[PDB]
Write an enzyme that holds these catalytic residues in place. Sequence first.
Site, PDB file in Angstrom:
ATOM      1  CE1 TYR A  32       0.613   3.517  -4.995  1.00 23.40           C
ATOM      2  CE2 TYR A  32       2.191   2.090  -3.880  1.00 23.40           C
ATOM      3  CZ  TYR A  32       1.699   2.662  -5.035  1.00 23.40           C
ATOM      4  OH  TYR A  32       2.314   2.414  -6.231  1.00 23.40           O
ATOM      5  CB  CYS A  33      -2.656  -1.572   0.372  1.00 23.63           C
ATOM      6  SG  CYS A  33      -3.655  -0.620   1.553  1.00 23.63           S
ATOM      7  CB  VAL A  34       1.881  -1.810  -3.309  1.00 27.23           C
ATOM      8  CG1 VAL A  34       2.652  -2.610  -4.358  1.00 27.23           C
ATOM      9  CG2 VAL A  34       0.961  -0.829  -3.997  1.00 27.23           C
ATOM     10  CB  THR A  35       5.004  -3.352   0.374  1.00 24.70           C
ATOM     11  OG1 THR A  35       5.617  -2.492  -0.594  1.00 24.70           O
ATOM     12  CG2 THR A  35       6.068  -4.217   1.007  1.00 24.70           C
ATOM     13  N   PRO A  73       4.295  -8.715   3.356  1.00 23.95           N
ATOM     14  CG  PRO A  73       3.284  -9.877   5.120  1.00 23.95           C
ATOM     15  CD  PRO A  73       2.970  -9.183   3.805  1.00 23.95           C
ATOM     16  N   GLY A  77       8.204  -6.862  -1.442  1.00 24.66           N
ATOM     17  CA  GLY A  77       8.239  -5.420  -1.527  1.00 24.66           C
ATOM     18  C   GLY A  77       8.725  -5.024  -2.900  1.00 24.66           C
ATOM     19  CD  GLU A 114       7.056   6.505  -3.070  1.00 27.15           C
ATOM     20  OE1 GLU A 114       7.088   6.870  -1.877  1.00 27.15           O
ATOM     21  OE2 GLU A 114       5.996   6.489  -3.737  1.00 27.15           O
ATOM     22  N   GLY A 115      10.945   2.203  -3.399  1.00 26.33           N
ATOM     23  CA  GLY A 115      12.044   1.661  -4.165  1.00 26.33           C
ATOM     24  C   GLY A 115      13.357   1.999  -3.489  1.00 26.33           C
ATOM     25  CD  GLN A 121      21.003  -0.902  -2.725  1.00 29.98           C
ATOM     26  OE1 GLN A 121      22.004  -0.190  -2.759  1.00 29.98           O
ATOM     27  NE2 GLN A 121      20.087  -0.804  -1.764  1.00 29.98           N
TER      28      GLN A 121
HETATM   29  C1  LIG Z   1       7.941   3.207   7.386  1.00 23.17           C
HETATM   30  C2  LIG Z   1       7.708   2.434   6.137  1.00 23.17           C
HETATM   31  C3  LIG Z   1       6.657   2.770   5.362  1.00 23.17           C
HETATM   32  C4  LIG Z   1       6.334   2.074   4.182  1.00 23.17           C
HETATM   33  N1  LIG Z   1       5.175   2.451   3.555  1.00 23.17           N
HETATM   34  C5  LIG Z   1       4.841   1.642   2.497  1.00 23.17           C
HETATM   35  C6  LIG Z   1       3.607   1.924   1.831  1.00 23.17           C
HETATM   36  O1  LIG Z   1       2.792   2.824   2.024  1.00 23.17           O
HETATM   37  N2  LIG Z   1       3.237   1.090   0.833  1.00 23.17           N
HETATM   38  C7  LIG Z   1       3.902   0.021   0.396  1.00 23.17           C
HETATM   39  O2  LIG Z   1       3.339  -0.617  -0.486  1.00 23.17           O
HETATM   40  N3  LIG Z   1       5.094  -0.260   1.001  1.00 23.17           N
HETATM   41  C8  LIG Z   1       5.527   0.540   2.025  1.00 23.17           C
HETATM   42  N4  LIG Z   1       6.741   0.241   2.720  1.00 23.17           N
HETATM   43  C9  LIG Z   1       7.571  -0.839   2.338  1.00 23.17           C
HETATM   44  C10 LIG Z   1       8.618  -0.420   1.314  1.00 23.17           C
HETATM   45  O3  LIG Z   1       7.963  -0.046   0.102  1.00 23.17           O
HETATM   46  C11 LIG Z   1       9.568  -1.580   1.090  1.00 23.17           C
HETATM   47  O4  LIG Z   1      10.304  -1.516   2.296  1.00 23.17           O
HETATM   48  C12 LIG Z   1      10.583  -1.448  -0.065  1.00 23.17           C
HETATM   49  O5  LIG Z   1      10.009  -1.038  -1.342  1.00 23.17           O
HETATM   50  C13 LIG Z   1      11.280  -2.787  -0.298  1.00 23.17           C
HETATM   51  O6  LIG Z   1      11.598  -3.272   0.982  1.00 23.17           O
HETATM   52  P1  LIG Z   1      11.308  -4.740   1.452  1.00 23.17           P
HETATM   53  O7  LIG Z   1      11.444  -4.701   2.935  1.00 23.17           O
HETATM   54  O8  LIG Z   1      10.116  -5.286   0.807  1.00 23.17           O
HETATM   55  O9  LIG Z   1      12.645  -5.139   0.689  1.00 23.17           O
HETATM   56  P2  LIG Z   1      13.007  -6.545   0.067  1.00 23.17           P
HETATM   57  O10 LIG Z   1      11.876  -6.963  -0.798  1.00 23.17           O
HETATM   58  O11 LIG Z   1      13.486  -7.343   1.234  1.00 23.17           O
HETATM   59  O12 LIG Z   1      14.278  -6.244  -0.802  1.00 23.17           O
HETATM   60  C14 LIG Z   1      15.034  -5.125  -0.434  1.00 23.17           C
HETATM   61  C15 LIG Z   1      16.461  -5.463  -0.007  1.00 23.17           C
HETATM   62  O13 LIG Z   1      17.157  -6.194  -1.039  1.00 23.17           O
HETATM   63  C16 LIG Z   1      17.793  -5.333  -1.988  1.00 23.17           C
HETATM   64  N5  LIG Z   1      17.322  -5.801  -3.298  1.00 23.17           N
HETATM   65  C17 LIG Z   1      16.162  -6.418  -3.607  1.00 23.17           C
HETATM   66  N6  LIG Z   1      16.115  -6.875  -4.837  1.00 23.17           N
HETATM   67  C18 LIG Z   1      17.316  -6.536  -5.392  1.00 23.17           C
HETATM   68  C19 LIG Z   1      17.846  -6.743  -6.628  1.00 23.17           C
HETATM   69  N7  LIG Z   1      17.226  -7.399  -7.584  1.00 23.17           N
HETATM   70  N8  LIG Z   1      19.062  -6.272  -6.848  1.00 23.17           N
HETATM   71  C20 LIG Z   1      19.709  -5.637  -5.902  1.00 23.17           C
HETATM   72  N9  LIG Z   1      19.322  -5.377  -4.685  1.00 23.17           N
HETATM   73  C21 LIG Z   1      18.075  -5.869  -4.483  1.00 23.17           C
HETATM   74  C22 LIG Z   1      17.306  -3.949  -1.541  1.00 23.17           C
HETATM   75  O14 LIG Z   1      18.235  -2.926  -1.981  1.00 23.17           O
HETATM   76  C23 LIG Z   1      17.326  -4.197  -0.005  1.00 23.17           C
HETATM   77  O15 LIG Z   1      18.601  -4.599   0.490  1.00 23.17           O
HETATM   78  C24 LIG Z   1       7.158   1.011   3.829  1.00 23.17           C
HETATM   79  C25 LIG Z   1       8.259   0.671   4.620  1.00 23.17           C
HETATM   80  C26 LIG Z   1       8.544   1.341   5.756  1.00 23.17           C
HETATM   81  C27 LIG Z   1       9.722   0.825   6.592  1.00 23.17           C
END
Ligand SMILES: Cc1cc2nc3c(=O)[nH]c(=O)nc-3n(C[C@H](O)[C@H](O)[C@H](O)COP(=O)(O)OP(=O)(O)OC[C@H]3O[C@@H](n4cnc5c(N)ncnc54)[C@H](O)[C@@H]3O)c2cc1C
Lengths: 387, 387, 387, 387
Positions: free
Chosen positions: B124-127, B129, B132, B367-368, B371
């Site tokens: 599932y490619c969505v996120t 760098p 997210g 998965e979100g 927060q």
């Molecule tokens: C092992 C692992 C596997 C993963 N697998 C997948 C995968 O298969 N597919 C995929 O697409 N992604 C995947 N991810 C990524 C994951 O989906 C994201 O980590 C997550 O949804 C958001 O994290 P970010 O690092 O992008 O967070 P960020 O975009 O940096 O934002 C998150 C941080 O800010 C807070 N935050 C952000 N916006 C707000 C707001 N408006 N109000 C309040 N708080 C806020 C969050 O609570 C947290 O502190 C994976 C991550 C890990 C570590």
Amino acid sequence: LGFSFEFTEQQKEFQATARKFAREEIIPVAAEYDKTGEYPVPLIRRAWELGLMNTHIPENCGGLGLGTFDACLISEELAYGCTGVQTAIEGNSLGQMPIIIAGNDQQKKKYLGRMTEEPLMCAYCVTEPGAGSDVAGIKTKAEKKGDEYIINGQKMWITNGGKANWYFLLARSDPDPKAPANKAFTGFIVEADTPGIQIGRKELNMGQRCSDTRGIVFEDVKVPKENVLIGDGAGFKVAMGAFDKTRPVVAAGAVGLAQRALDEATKYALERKTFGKLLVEHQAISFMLAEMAMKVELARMSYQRAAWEVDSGRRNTYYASIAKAFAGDIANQLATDAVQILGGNGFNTEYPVEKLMRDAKIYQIYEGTSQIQRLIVAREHIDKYKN
Amino acid sequence: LGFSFEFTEQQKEFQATARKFAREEIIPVAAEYDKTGEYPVPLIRRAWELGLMNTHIPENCGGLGLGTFDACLISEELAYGCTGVQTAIEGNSLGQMPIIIAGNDQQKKKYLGRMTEEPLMCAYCVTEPGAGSDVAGIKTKAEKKGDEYIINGQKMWITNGGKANWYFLLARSDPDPKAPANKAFTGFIVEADTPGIQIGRKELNMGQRCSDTRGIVFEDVKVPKENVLIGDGAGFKVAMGAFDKTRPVVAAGAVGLAQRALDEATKYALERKTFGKLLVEHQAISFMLAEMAMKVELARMSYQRAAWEVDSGRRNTYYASIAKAFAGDIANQLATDAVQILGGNGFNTEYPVEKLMRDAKIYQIYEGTSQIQRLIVAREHIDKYKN
Amino acid sequence: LGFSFEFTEQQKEFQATARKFAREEIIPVAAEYDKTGEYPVPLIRRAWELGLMNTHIPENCGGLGLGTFDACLISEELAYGCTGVQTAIEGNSLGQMPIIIAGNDQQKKKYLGRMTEEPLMCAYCVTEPGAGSDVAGIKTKAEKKGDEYIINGQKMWITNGGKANWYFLLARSDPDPKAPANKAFTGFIVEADTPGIQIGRKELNMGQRCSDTRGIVFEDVKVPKENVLIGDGAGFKVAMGAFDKTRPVVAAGAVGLAQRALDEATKYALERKTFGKLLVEHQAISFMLAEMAMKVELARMSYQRAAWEVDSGRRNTYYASIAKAFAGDIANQLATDAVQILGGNGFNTEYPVEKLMRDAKIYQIYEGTSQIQRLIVAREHIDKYKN
Amino acid sequence: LGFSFEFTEQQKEFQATARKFAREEIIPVAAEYDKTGEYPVPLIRRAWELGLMNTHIPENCGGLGLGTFDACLISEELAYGCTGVQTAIEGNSLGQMPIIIAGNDQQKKKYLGRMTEEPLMCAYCVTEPGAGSDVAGIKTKAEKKGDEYIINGQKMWITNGGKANWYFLLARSDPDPKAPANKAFTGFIVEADTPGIQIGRKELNMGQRCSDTRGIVFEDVKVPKENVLIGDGAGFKVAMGAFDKTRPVVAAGAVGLAQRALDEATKYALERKTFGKLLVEHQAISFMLAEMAMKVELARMSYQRAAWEVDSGRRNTYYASIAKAFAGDIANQLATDAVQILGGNGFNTEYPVEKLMRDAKIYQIYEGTSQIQRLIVAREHIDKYKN
Ligand SMILES: Cc1cc2nc3c(=O)[nH]c(=O)nc-3n(C[C@H](O)[C@H](O)[C@H](O)COP(=O)(O)OP(=O)(O)OC[C@H]3O[C@@H](n4cnc5c(N)ncnc54)[C@H](O)[C@@H]3O)c2cc1C
Ligand SMILES: Cc1cc2nc3c(=O)[nH]c(=O)nc-3n(C[C@H](O)[C@H](O)[C@H](O)COP(=O)(O)OP(=O)(O)OC[C@H]3O[C@@H](n4cnc5c(N)ncnc54)[C@H](O)[C@@H]3O)c2cc1C
Ligand SMILES: Cc1cc2nc3c(=O)[nH]c(=O)nc-3n(C[C@H](O)[C@H](O)[C@H](O)COP(=O)(O)OP(=O)(O)OC[C@H]3O[C@@H](n4cnc5c(N)ncnc54)[C@H](O)[C@@H]3O)c2cc1C
Ligand SMILES: Cc1cc2nc3c(=O)[nH]c(=O)nc-3n(C[C@H](O)[C@H](O)[C@H](O)COP(=O)(O)OP(=O)(O)OC[C@H]3O[C@@H](n4cnc5c(N)ncnc54)[C@H](O)[C@@H]3O)c2cc1C
């Protein structure tokens, strides 16, 4: 065979009635009986007329025969209106359960059937001056004097204990202090008019002011022998087994309180402007509401599981203690958070949440305080692990 | 049709299977795969062979045609064994969901079919760098070019990328920034072998070391136009829909872990003595345990309710987010408590509890993040009061 | 005379030396040391050079002769760099304390003096595989055999175990089980090179991986009576008494880690944005930093107060345990929140916040578990009211 | 110079005097005043007599010339008796604060001087029905007309509202809405007995039912130029100014009630036994006390720090905001635990604990809600991470 979270047409009809009654008769007068302090006499009457009181009384006794689950959904709705009057009517069922489960036709008809014919109350006298959560610490003794029994003791904090027709009464019939609880205690359904029954005044408590509460001194009360529930020896087992189909109903009242709190809180946050925006637009508040909603949400499912457990013939004791503690707690948090979101007006008496807070407190105390509830949960938990 | 908290016979079988397999096979090796971090190949295989994999594929494409509730019972058991593994297996069902909910039989037969004949993994490619949580702003380009699209973007943290046969991809189509998320994107299937794709190295994380989480870039990847899921734009509406069905399973995934932490703490509590008393005999450990169990029982119900809701036909968005948030929040709570229960040993690597703590974190992140979950919960809740 | 939250110029400059070192030499290499798990010798001697080691050694043995307050100060700085290396340093002060408080002029000059002239490490041998929180329940034998005592037992989780020149050791000197702990144990100074001492294998834990922790098997180890503390039997007093001067610095250790978290978390909050507004703009995240800020400012004062108390020559115990209880608990809360702030990234190994989550944990477990810290505080607090 | 947590012999006097008074005079009468909801006039004059009201009025106006740290000191002891009676006291220092920091000599001697020779009261008028937390949102006007300003608007929740001799009144001067608050409001010194001042009914609130909080309306209250604080525009400045001196004092209030609740719960735990043992012997109850004790001490250090900073000539907004934030929160946790430990009796009006839980809530509302306290803390903390 399959999980389901949808009521029945019968059950829905109930929640529909209770809802209508609470939102349309109780709520609009909820404040007065809280200020005035007086017993909600007429509302007690109306519920009776609407059949929302004494749901569990067996069908043969003319009682509606509704299960614990029904009691819980109906109760929650009433609680939304007022936990004072809700607890008031829940007092009956609480004190009736001991009979309903340990009674023989005679006992059940001559006592339950009366409530069937007229709207009369009944109380669960057990808690007293130095023994509350510690059931087996009661000093009220019951000495059998041939033909019938002689009661000499004192009770405390008895709901609807001053408006009751009859009382469920627990006592110690084994004089030896070291006499185990499974054989030292004996219960007696005991009519009120029995002389030597002095009842105290209405205790001023910080909440559920319209609910009736006071103490009772049973000095040289001649209890007629045929009334002894299961017989001299089994009193403790009765009382303990009674509230297993009661606590879930208790939690139901607490989550009903959480709901109202959440309902008044959300509505206010939707219109109160602060810093150019509706309170809901302030993320702190948004989060406050969300978490509040998931707490009330989880609490409903916490009792619905316990009601169903007993209703399908099982000892819900484990889940019963879960629902009770959760609901009892989240009830307390939502109220305060609601008072918190309303702000100054929240502290104001002309606003709902004020009362909602003071009321909720009691859910962590009567019918198993938070502490003892967790003690029971672990007791059961650990027991599912040992050999 | 009345409430029922009782599984259906069929389910009990799966349960026992998912269980038997996890307790007799995953466990003995969960630590080796944590130590070495090597992909759990033999386990996933044995999972697919034991039939606990790719459950959502319809009978049409020759799949078990299982519902979310069923999927949850299965994942919650496999998770108790090792979420690092549980996730690798889950990533398949997660990456297949978009197709399963929005794909035309040509795509379904082709891509979901192969999944059944040979044990494979999809992603599932969505996120990306720097993108997210804010899905409505993932910047990966997808340009129209006749009977195909050209993709120039970048993803990060793909669960199962690097070991995927095909990927589900969310890419921005309409280059115009004023274009509503709605229509801004376009999701399609991409075979991993397609030249232009670069697979990054396995990112080392704290917990769920054996899952394959790595980087990946699409440098002028050609996707034949048929591979698209619905149409230019529909993209945002596709991936977004995978959540109604995947979200609950992640909660079940947390619950499983919570159960593991709990079981470990309790077992030890019934053996380790301090001050001439078993740990469980200390009223503080008993309290910790009652609250640990109280958390899971509730959490479990939270996810089941969700899975059911979506399966009965109605939208479970409000309920799904409750389970994800709550379960994700308690799974971490329980984890740290389990470590604490096992004292010094707890902090040591030759004990299960320590590993649990590391794995648990991701449930509050992917998965979100918790927060954003509450953003949804408050969203669905407040909207009701504004209708 | 009145309150003052001012430092002295001397202190001010200790802090600055502490910081420079932690932020310039420790911090860069930290992660590298964590990965390998290798013992950070360079830093150990560098600190020994800079004087950020063995500050309790009275100026007469060639030490700095600094109090508990000035110690905590220094500790928080090192901790900020890495608690793994910091514990490796502070662990010396632990093994030294019993000698500093109960030693005698001859002993102190011999076992403290060698620390002055060489970068030597020393341990605190007390805990046994089956005793830790229950000091009184230790079984390492030590019986008078001529003019020396014969020791036979096993110690566990001894920080600096396999790197110590000498160890402080608590052993049961009275065979008679009914011997009251307050006059039942005897503490000795045992040079590690003494035959019969089998230093166990390096243990592997979750956090603080570079701290050389391992158990010791004292096989008929014969120590001279000249190394006994103030007598046979008074060993327990020395053990419990040293705590009053060590708990404050261990609480500072937690606060240090807590400040590193609040820094990495806050700094990210400033460069990372989601949904247009930076993270530090999202009200919830602002509230996260706010709660994170509060937790540290108080914990700092908690350990500060406790240090000052003992430095002013008072009974410490009640404040220091509050410190270790609070600081220990909040540390874990900050290190975890920090990871959550960085989302997917904070969970990755290439990041500083993740390592802290592992480290934080022992601040609740080692050197007075959170549960007994509460027991201790409960004992003191209530005693103010009992007669 | 080094740290110090020692009182000046002079402070030990104010304390011992306040403790003597508030415990031997406030405590007894207290309960009555809350039930009757009558102004504590008798107790007020008594404090004025002991010289511990108006502590902040400078020595040149015949005041005591005491600092914030000394006001809090006294305040806590006063709160321990009844925050209802104490809040009524703080009403003066609040109405006085803006003039102590921004009024000229003639103003300081005209209005402060009187509180020195007659036990009069003052009040703080800022909050409006439509805006409290959002201070910049007040709509009261200040029409410059000749040598007077015409006040038109309403204030709400004014403590001492009807009993006040003169009020401090913030208002909007420049009609332009786009006027930056800091130079748009004007603070006045309005003499209570002026023609266009209409008070209103005493608001019955859930807590602190003896201090009079009322709404009030101004209809063409000519206020002479002579009574403006700094000048037109300089209202917001002087307003924000005051909060720094006052914050630690309100925190002191909360921390006061906290210990009242902590003492009550402890004294009870030493007399009530259940299951063969006083409550202090059950780990659960004990653990509560410990954690209750911890918080009270940290809250104490919370305001003491905040008071020291300001008195040392430092901007305390950071620490003062964590003091009110924290002390407010734990005051509300303690009040509800005290009740809990006293069980059913705790819920009874005949007991003190229920009376604490009620007055406790206001501390998370007025003078700036916990929410804005977090905002200011987050805001004060982020500035340290940008430059
Ligand atoms: C092992 C692992 C596997 C993963 N697998 C997948 C995968 O298969 N597919 C995929 O697409 N992604 C995947 N991810 C990524 C994951 O989906 C994201 O980590 C997550 O949804 C958001 O994290 P970010 O690092 O992008 O967070 P960020 O975009 O940096 O934002 C998150 C941080 O800010 C807070 N935050 C952000 N916006 C707000 C707001 N408006 N109000 C309040 N708080 C806020 C969050 O609570 C947290 O502190 C994976 C991550 C890990 C570590
Ligand atoms: C309005 C109202 C209605 C009520 N109605 C009824 C009624 O109809 N019938 C009836 O019989 N009773 C009724 N009660 C009484 C109530 O059920 C009891 O007070 C309750 O059992 C709590 O016990 P206590 O306060 O006597 O127990 P206490 O033991 O005095 O409880 C006080 C505190 O001690 C803690 N504690 C006690 N023992 C332990 C332990 N072993 N381990 C850990 N913590 C412990 C408790 O949790 C609580 O926090 C009612 C009370 C009120 C105020
Ligand atoms: C990395 C590390 C380094 C250490 N270094 C040293 C060292 O250099 N020297 C040394 O001598 N020791 C050392 N220790 C040992 C450490 O102090 C013990 O780990 C600690 O005393 C408690 O762990 P335990 O395993 O003994 O706890 P256990 O005795 O196993 O206690 C287990 C759990 O039960 C709870 N509990 C216990 N008794 C009660 C009770 N009465 N009531 C309620 N709850 C209770 C405890 O709080 C804990 O949660 C170290 C430990 C670690 C992890
Ligand atoms: C008994 C009492 C005595 C008082 N005495 C005085 C007095 O002497 N003088 C005086 O002038 N005033 C006084 N007040 C008023 C009091 O200071 C205010 O009521 C208080 O600031 C709350 O403002 P509000 O009630 O208008 O809250 P509102 O602003 O109406 O809404 C507040 C609620 O929403 C939250 N909220 C608001 N803005 C935000 C935001 N931006 N982000 C997140 N959450 C937010 C608040 O924290 C709280 O939960 C008193 C009030 C009471 C009840």
